[PDB]
Design an enzyme around this catalytic site. Structure first.
Site, PDB file in Angstrom:
ATOM      1  N   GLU A 100       1.191  -1.673  -0.293  1.00  0.00           N
ATOM      2  CA  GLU A 100      -0.415  -0.086  -0.129  1.00  0.00           C
ATOM      3  C   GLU A 100       0.838   1.260  -0.071  1.00  0.00           C
ATOM      4  O   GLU A 100       0.635   2.523  -0.527  1.00  0.00           O
ATOM      5  CB  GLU A 100      -0.754   0.404   1.357  1.00  0.00           C
ATOM      6  CG  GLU A 100      -1.783   1.844   1.320  1.00  0.00           C
ATOM      7  CD  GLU A 100      -2.315   1.192   2.845  1.00  0.00           C
ATOM      8  OE1 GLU A 100      -2.250   1.278   3.833  1.00  0.00           O
ATOM      9  OE2 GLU A 100      -3.459   1.511   1.785  1.00  0.00           O
ATOM     10  N   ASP A 101       2.500   1.577   1.233  1.00  0.00           N
ATOM     11  CA  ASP A 101       2.749   2.258   0.553  1.00  0.00           C
ATOM     12  C   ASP A 101       3.713   2.953  -0.438  1.00  0.00           C
ATOM     13  O   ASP A 101       3.421   3.969  -0.809  1.00  0.00           O
ATOM     14  CB  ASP A 101       3.938   2.254   1.856  1.00  0.00           C
ATOM     15  CG  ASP A 101       3.786   2.070   3.234  1.00  0.00           C
ATOM     16  OD1 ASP A 101       1.776   2.992   3.498  1.00  0.00           O
ATOM     17  OD2 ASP A 101       3.251   1.535   3.963  1.00  0.00           O
ATOM     18  N   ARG A 149       6.425  10.394   7.463  1.00  0.00           N
ATOM     19  CA  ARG A 149       6.833   9.802   6.192  1.00  0.00           C
ATOM     20  C   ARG A 149       6.562  10.473   5.029  1.00  0.00           C
ATOM     21  O   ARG A 149       6.779  10.142   3.922  1.00  0.00           O
ATOM     22  CB  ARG A 149       6.365   8.329   6.324  1.00  0.00           C
ATOM     23  CG  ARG A 149       6.562   7.069   7.139  1.00  0.00           C
ATOM     24  CD  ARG A 149       7.550   6.491   6.604  1.00  0.00           C
ATOM     25  NE  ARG A 149       7.684   5.369   7.271  1.00  0.00           N
ATOM     26  CZ  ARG A 149       8.095   4.086   7.170  1.00  0.00           C
ATOM     27  NH1 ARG A 149       6.601   3.983   6.653  1.00  0.00           N
ATOM     28  NH2 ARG A 149       8.093   3.310   8.275  1.00  0.00           N
ATOM     29  N   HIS A 168       1.172   7.180  10.260  1.00  0.00           N
ATOM     30  CA  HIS A 168       0.201   7.491   9.078  1.00  0.00           C
ATOM     31  C   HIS A 168      -1.566   7.796   9.769  1.00  0.00           C
ATOM     32  O   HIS A 168      -1.604   7.595  10.668  1.00  0.00           O
ATOM     33  CB  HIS A 168      -0.050   6.107   8.463  1.00  0.00           C
ATOM     34  CG  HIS A 168       1.443   5.274   7.369  1.00  0.00           C
ATOM     35  ND1 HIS A 168       1.287   4.269   7.402  1.00  0.00           N
ATOM     36  CD2 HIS A 168       2.482   6.332   7.281  1.00  0.00           C
ATOM     37  CE1 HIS A 168       2.028   4.054   6.983  1.00  0.00           C
ATOM     38  NE2 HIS A 168       3.078   5.282   6.492  1.00  0.00           N
ATOM     39  N   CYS A 221      -2.896  -1.717   5.019  1.00  0.00           N
ATOM     40  CA  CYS A 221      -0.950  -2.230   4.266  1.00  0.00           C
ATOM     41  C   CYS A 221      -0.592  -2.903   3.472  1.00  0.00           C
ATOM     42  O   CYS A 221      -0.037  -3.157   2.095  1.00  0.00           O
ATOM     43  CB  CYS A 221       0.168  -2.371   5.732  1.00  0.00           C
ATOM     44  SG  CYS A 221      -0.381  -0.734   6.979  1.00  0.00           S
TER      45      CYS A 221
END
Length: 273
Positions: free
Chosen positions: A70-71, A137, A165, A266
């Site tokens: 996901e990131d 991030r 997050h 995620c």
């Protein structure tokens, strides 16, 4: 229709994940074997149970966090933004993700700006607009590139306080429905998001911030579907999700990867083809 998906990209856990976890665990150590079982179950729900076409990427031992797909990408309609993760050790994860999305015939946009960082985990897409968490991030430049990539949607930023997050305490639970934690931080973030948007969202409040991270899907053969943390993990939050009588609720375990900040959203990137 919001939440519709036909394909999903996931990635296997590298053995190196166990090593890197030794410096992230706040308490109990990660049971790698169990983490693998929970991942297998997770993919099983998405593919076998819900019928999504699964693109399973192989693990890369040089990328301990490769399971958290996901990131590295944010997909909206037929366009994919390949991100520049905040953590430098995760930059190469974009290589295979870019290939996977190219093969799914999506329009590709890469975040190349060396001063921009953005984790997909900080992005909340409501179906009408984007909320991007400014965290350790994701930065302003990153949010701006996302806005430039999805030009037909408003993008608003929100400070991420005592969490990794933005989605460490929220996620979409259905059409116009935002699942949100009860912490001071989560509620403040929600107030800011509602203040910036010109649209009134409904909310599903849960007592455990982590349990506010769920995956909502609209499956033609099942209707509203929601993957949420189990009653064994968060009894009080599961009780709230049970209130969604029109949703097909699916309890999914994630006790192991949560130890390293990996929540339900995620481990997958959903695509509607």
């Amino acid at each position: 229709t919001f939440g519709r998906a036909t394909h999903v990209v996931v990635r296997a856990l590298p053995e190196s994940l166990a090593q890197q976890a030794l410096r992230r665990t706040k308490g109990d150590e990660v049971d790698f074997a169990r983490a693998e079982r929970q991942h297998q179950l997770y993919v099983g729900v998405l593919g076998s149970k819900l019928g999504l076409q699964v693109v399973q990427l192989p693990a890369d031992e040089s990328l301990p966090d490769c399971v958290f797909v996901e990131d590295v990408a944010v997909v909206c309609e037929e366009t994919a933004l390949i991100t520049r993760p905040g953590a430098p050790s995760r930059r190469k994860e974009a290589d295979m993700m870019k290939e996977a999305l190219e093969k799914l015939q999506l329009n590709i946009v890469e975040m190349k700006d060396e001063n921009a960082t953005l984790d997909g985990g900080d992005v909340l897409f409501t179906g009408r607009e984007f909320f991007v968490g400014l965290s350790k991030r994701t930065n302003q430049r990153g949010a701006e590139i996302l806005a430039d990539t999805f030009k037909d949607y408003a993008v608003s930023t929100v400070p991420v306080v005592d969490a990794l997050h933005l989605k460490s305490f929220c996620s979409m639970a259905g059409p116009n429905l935002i699942a949100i934690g009860s912490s001071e931080s989560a509620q403040k973030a929600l107030k800011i998001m509602q203040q910036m948007s010109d649209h009134r969202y409904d909310k599903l409040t849960v007592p455990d911030d982590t349990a506010a991270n769920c995956i909502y899907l609209n499956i033609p053969s099942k209707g509203h579907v929601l993957l949420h943390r189990t009653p064994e993990e968060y009894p009080e939050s599961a009780k709230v999700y049970e209130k969604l009588k029109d949703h097909m609720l699916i309890p999914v375990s994630n006790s192991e990867l949560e130890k390293v900040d990996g929540l339900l959203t995620c481990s997958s990137v959903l695509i509607n083809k």
